[PDB]
Enzyme design. Structure first.
Site, PDB file in Angstrom:
ATOM      1  N   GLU A  11       5.689  14.403  11.039  1.00  0.00           N
ATOM      2  CA  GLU A  11       4.533  15.264  10.394  1.00  0.00           C
ATOM      3  C   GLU A  11       3.266  15.239  10.997  1.00  0.00           C
ATOM      4  O   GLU A  11       2.325  16.251  10.832  1.00  0.00           O
ATOM      5  CB  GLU A  11       4.454  14.866   8.954  1.00  0.00           C
ATOM      6  CG  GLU A  11       5.747  15.124   8.130  1.00  0.00           C
ATOM      7  CD  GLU A  11       6.244  16.159   8.053  1.00  0.00           C
ATOM      8  OE1 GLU A  11       5.375  17.063   8.403  1.00  0.00           O
ATOM      9  OE2 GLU A  11       7.077  16.522   7.222  1.00  0.00           O
ATOM     10  N   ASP A  20       1.347  24.699   8.303  1.00  0.00           N
ATOM     11  CA  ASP A  20       2.403  24.177   8.747  1.00  0.00           C
ATOM     12  C   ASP A  20       3.514  25.076   9.629  1.00  0.00           C
ATOM     13  O   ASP A  20       3.148  26.033  10.146  1.00  0.00           O
ATOM     14  CB  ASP A  20       3.325  23.647   7.461  1.00  0.00           C
ATOM     15  CG  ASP A  20       4.099  24.237   6.776  1.00  0.00           C
ATOM     16  OD1 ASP A  20       4.353  25.483   7.113  1.00  0.00           O
ATOM     17  OD2 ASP A  20       4.735  23.807   5.684  1.00  0.00           O
TER      18      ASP A  20
END
Ligand SMILES: [Cl-]
Ligand SMILES: [Cl-]
Length: 162
Positions: A11, A20
């Site tokens: 991540e 994202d």
């Protein structure tokens, strides 16, 4: 290697609100803030998550704190979910980290479409499960991360991640 280092590799860490892969406002270590398009709605949820006026920026500690909460809740939801639990219980420690990884990224809800792959993991048919896991939007959208998680389920080692 452990769950924390594994997710921090997948991540990354960003101290400023960003979007994202699906275009949702996130901050820190993969912490989804909101699925709304509003940067304002995002700043609001962030301030609410941190307990201060942040103006869209947080410190490393604050990010890590959010990260500790999110792994803990990922785990705890797996344990409370009746289809998840039995899969999780059946797995060894490495493979359990792979399952948590999936849950953190896609929620109990995304992981619902893996009925067939979950049954294959439970039965310990590694190669088949790896083939079934690849036929998903997940794998098509984030192929490199999917391949690493997938390899962890196939092998039972942390090779994809040294
Ligand atoms: Cl929160
Ligand atoms: Cl990827």
């Amino acid at each position: 290697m452990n769950i924390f280092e594994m997710l921090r590799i997948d991540e990354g860490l960003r101290l400023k609100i960003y979007k994202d892969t699906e275009g949702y406002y996130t901050i820190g270590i993969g912490h989804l803030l909101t699925k709304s398009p509003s940067l304002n709605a995002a700043k609001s949820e962030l301030d609410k998550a941190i307990g201060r006026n942040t103006n869209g920026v947080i410190t490393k500690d604050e990010a890590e704190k959010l990260f500790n909460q999110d792994v803990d809740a990922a785990v705890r939801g797996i344990l409370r979910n009746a289809k998840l639990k039995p899969v999780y219980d059946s797995l060894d420690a490495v493979r359990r980290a792979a399952f948590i990884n999936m849950v953190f990224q896609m929620g109990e809800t995304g992981i619902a479409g893996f009925t067939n792959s979950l049954r294959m993991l439970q039965q310990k048919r590694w190669d088949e499960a790896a083939v079934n896991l690849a036929k998903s939007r997940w794998y098509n959208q984030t192929p490199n991360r999917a391949k690493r998680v997938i390899t962890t389920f196939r092998t039972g080692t942390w090779d994809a991640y040294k």
